């Protein structure tokens, strides 16, 4: 599923992601834009033999299970498909813990170098 931008802003809400560790909605919506185009069934492979997967680009290597990235962690307790869903509730269940391991949203490459700094309520004006 490709979602719309104020769609994807109500899920993402009535999931409990707006101030969710201090991140404002809107810096959720930029860092979905920018690493997935808002598509769930997204999917890249990274150099060490990993894949990123679904609208947040969550990483095999530590956090779900596609069967071939040996030596890796499940952490979210899913196999890495749950993520390609048009139900956003496992990647967001997910992603909650992510943000919470130290690092905040740094672990998305996208947020910081393209919205980390900037007018993030920008990418929620609008929508009801
Ligand atoms: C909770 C997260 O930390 C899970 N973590 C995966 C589990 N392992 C071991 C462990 O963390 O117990 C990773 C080891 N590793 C360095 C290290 O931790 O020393 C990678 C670091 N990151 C994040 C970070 O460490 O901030 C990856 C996510
Ligand atoms: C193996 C290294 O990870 C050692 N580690 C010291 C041991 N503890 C707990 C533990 O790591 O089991 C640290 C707790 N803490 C984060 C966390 O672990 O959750 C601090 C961060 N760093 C590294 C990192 O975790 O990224 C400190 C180095
Ligand atoms: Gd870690
Ligand atoms: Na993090």
Not at 79 to 100: F, R, Y
Request: aromatic share 10%.
């Amino acid at each position: 599923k490709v979602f719309g931008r104020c769609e994807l802003a109500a899920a993402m809400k009535r999931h409990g992601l707006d101030n969710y560790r201090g991140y404002s909605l809107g810096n959720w919506v930029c860092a979905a834009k920018f690493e997935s185009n808002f598509n769930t069934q997204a999917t890249n492979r990274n150099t060490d033999g990993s894949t990123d997967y679904g609208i947040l680009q969550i990483n095999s290597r530590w956090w779900c299970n596609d069967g071939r990235t040996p030596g890796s962690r499940n952490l979210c307790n899913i196999p890495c498909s749950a993520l390609l869903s048009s139900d956003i509730t496992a990647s967001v269940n997910c992603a909650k813990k992510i943000v919470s391991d130290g690092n905040g949203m740094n672990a998305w490459v996208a947020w910081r170098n393209r919205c980390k700094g900037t007018d993030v309520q920008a990418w929620i004006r609008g929508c009801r």
